[PDB]
Design a protein around this ligand. Structure first.
Ligand SMILES: [Zn+2]
Lengths: 57, 96, 55, 68, 112
RNA sequence: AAAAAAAAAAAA
RNA sequence: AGGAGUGGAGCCUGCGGCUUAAUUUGACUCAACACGGGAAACCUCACCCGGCCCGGACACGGACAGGAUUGACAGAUUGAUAGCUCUUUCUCGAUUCCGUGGGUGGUGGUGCAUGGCCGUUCUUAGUUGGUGGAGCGAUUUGUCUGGUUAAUUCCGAUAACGAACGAGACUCUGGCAUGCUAACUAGUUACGCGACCCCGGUCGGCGUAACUUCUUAGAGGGACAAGUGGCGUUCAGCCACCCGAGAUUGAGCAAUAACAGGUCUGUGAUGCCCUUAGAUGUCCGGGGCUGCACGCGCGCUACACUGACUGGCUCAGCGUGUGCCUACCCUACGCCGGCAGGCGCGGGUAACCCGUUGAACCCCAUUCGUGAUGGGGAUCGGGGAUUGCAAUUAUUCCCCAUGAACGAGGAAUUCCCAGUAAGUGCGGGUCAUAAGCUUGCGUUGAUUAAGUCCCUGCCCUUUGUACACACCGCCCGU
């Protein structure tokens, strides 16, 4: 997500800019297992860093 | 300040159940979002609580766009005097 | 009627439909990814969002 | 303050007296006789009267005009 | 918004920082403050009414938030907490030189 | 017939 | 040494000036002038003309349910169906009307009260302790005659050794591992089927046995002047060459000290001054920021044949994509219309759908023929579509007419060493309608040089000082 803004709050000075990015990495694993293991995985290893979402087709 | 009566006592009874409410700073907003069951304004609401500020019953914090109000025990006994309730029901902030 | 003439210009469109969510000023807005918030407060609170100096 | 353009004053409602004693007519009997037609709508109550104009009677908060 | 809210609220209670955690039905947040006896108030009233404020302002199902309180170790090793400490000292009114030497000696005795 | 006077006044 | 140019012509934008009831203001050498993310039809708005509401919280004192006041109707009334007034009060019932203090608000003044932020000195390479030495001491050596590098980067001469900041070091991307860990939301190869030609050929046509060869992205390494020869105190280091993917890819942060540099018009960051009901607050309507003898600066288009026009062929990557307040998302397919556009019809909350993003330039085949011409499209008239409450002072686009200046521009001046300048096209911000601006992406892709202090600035050493508020200095005489 690249966002380029200015540097001066006013309109005086050298025409200088700044750059903002993140690194966002996506991982998925498909599993051939029943839903009880899925709920055990959801309940275990809870951290605020990475969120867990599950879908069934 | 040509504001009605039943809306203000509705605000007061929802204050006595929980002594904190939030309200965004928007004069051009005819409807309160949380109090959507009946037609209430927002500017009259925030003017009523800044009148309570002038009386000295709550204290005010303004962070980004929302006014924040906090209930005092002297404000609690003011609510007891104005609503004329016996001292046997307490707002849920003091309870466990 | 003052109560019916108070809202005669709709804010369906234009620059008046949005303002800053911090300083409440209608200049230098960021509509990208729905920030809806001005550039100087963006620079002030950009570190708290998660935005970093990498480039 | 007093500028070049004069300011039109606000509508000073003159305090009338014995208006509430002017609704019904006092006789020997205790029955009521009002001079204002009643409000049959649900917006204004049964005790709400009309106005007393020269030609047509007007509601209060109903803001409804019933002509003849 | 939460960081600016707690910075504006706990100006005199020794606010250091907060941590945000995401969990279904247990969206809990922990505030680290220097003054543990003042963030709770009277039998934990203040933490519960701040919980009510953030609950009714941010918007969740009720009972999904459980705020905790914790004292951060190495209070002198936090640049924020020393900044509100210096602001608290200078708001009472003292000399800048002696207070600055006191906070410099406190940082040097804190192990920095 | 016009000026500007330069000094900020400890180091708790 | 060169390349592209600007300054010349037309057009867009800003400033000055003039004009205006108003043409709101800041910013005047680098370090202001396509700047305030400022492409202003209405809000923007701070400017002018006009009219209502209080948003006077409130403390005290006059008034209190018997009424303190808002909300309105035939009609003069601007501008409106604002009752703002005037004909008439029921309607709100203590929520209040009035006098003083007090309070609030202000894109009002003060950036020379400031905080914070940013620019500039300067991204040049410049600062500082500890110990010891010299001097009575202020102070000086360390920081240097010299050689080298982008670098106070090293070597080395040497009462100097031992360290820190800045630079380097660090982080991100690319350059490649036919290695490793893995891809039905990316594909490859085999097999089967289907379509056509003549036994093989093509299919981004269909389906299912392995795989990372493309793509995707994790862990690792490679590159370090490693080797040879030459120059050089044979040191630091430099040059040429071989093997090797690369023997200088680019960007971020950037030391001490300082500017009367800019921002009270980003903030509910903020001191003082002014004002506050008949408002320098707010709301609504219209106009004005665009206005025109003129002068300056960013940019666009061309001054043609290395070109214009008409058809065919063929080639990408950053991206973006349905909303808390909010309602404005990206589109394929199928008809109507020359066209901009109109109606149905699905997909996508995203490697799946737009999309294999069939981009432009370029290439191939005609027409054109040195003529202000088929170049250039300024100016101008009419018609037709979409956005929005509203397009006149053309919002934008489409179609046909209209075809000016311009024959490569004086003085003067700017940017640039490899996928670089330059010619193109595509995304993001601006956005209801929306790019002549800016930030990125991608195609093609050069000439010249591996140096100098001449110009223009910066830095350092030495020298002189009757200067220390420091030459914008001190100081003599009538
Ligand atoms: Zn009625």
């Amino acid at each position: 997500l690249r966002i380029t803004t200015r540097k001066t709050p006013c309109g005086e000075g050298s025409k200088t800019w700044d750059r903002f990015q993140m690194r966002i990495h996506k991982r998925l694993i498909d599993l051939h297992s029943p839903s009880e293991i899925v709920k055990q995985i959801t309940s275990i290893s809870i951290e605020p860093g990475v969120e867990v979402e599950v879908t069934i087709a | 300040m040509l504001m009605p009566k039943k809306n203000r006592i509705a605000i007061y009874e929802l204050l006595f159940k929980e002594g904190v409410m939030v309200a965004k700073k928007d004069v051009h907003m005819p409807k309160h979002p949380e109090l959507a069951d009946k037609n209430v304004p927002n500017l009259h609401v925030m003017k009523a609580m800044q009148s309570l500020k002038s009386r000295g019953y709550v204290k005010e914090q303004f962070a980004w766009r929302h006014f924040y109000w906090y209930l005092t025990n002297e404000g609690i006994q003011y609510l007891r005097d104005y609503l004329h309730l016996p001292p046997e029901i307490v707002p849920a902030t003091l309870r466990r | 009627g003052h109560q019916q003439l108070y809202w005669s210009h709709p804010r369906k469109f234009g620059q008046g439909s949005r303002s800053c969510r911090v300083c409440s000023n209608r200049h230098g807005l960021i509509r990208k990814y729905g920030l809806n918030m001005c550039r100087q407060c963006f620079r002030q609170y950009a570190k708290d969002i998660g935005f970093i100096k990498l480039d | 303050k007093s500028y070049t353009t004069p300011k039109k004053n606000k509508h000073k409602r003159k305090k009338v007296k014995l208006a509430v004693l002017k609704y019904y007519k006092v006789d020997e009997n205790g029955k009521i006789s009002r001079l204002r037609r009643e409000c049959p709508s649900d917006e204004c109550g049964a005790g709400v009267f009309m106005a007393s104009h020269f030609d047509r009677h007007y509601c209060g908060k109903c803001c409804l005009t019933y002509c003849f | 918004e939460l960081n600016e809210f707690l910075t504006r609220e706990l100006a005199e209670d020794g606010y250091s920082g907060v941590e945000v955690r995401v969990t279904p039905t247990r969206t809990e947040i922990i505030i680290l403050a220097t003054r543990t006896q003042n963030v709770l108030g009277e039998k934990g009233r203040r933490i519960r009414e701040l919980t009510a404020v953030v609950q009714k302002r941010f918007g969740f199902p009720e009972g999904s938030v459980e705020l905790y309180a914790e004292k951060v170790a190495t209070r002198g090793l936090c640049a924020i907490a020393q900044a509100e400490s210096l602001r608290y000292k200078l708001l009472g009114g003292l000399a800048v030189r002696r207070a600055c030497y006191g906070v410099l000696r406190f940082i040097m005795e804190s192990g920095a």
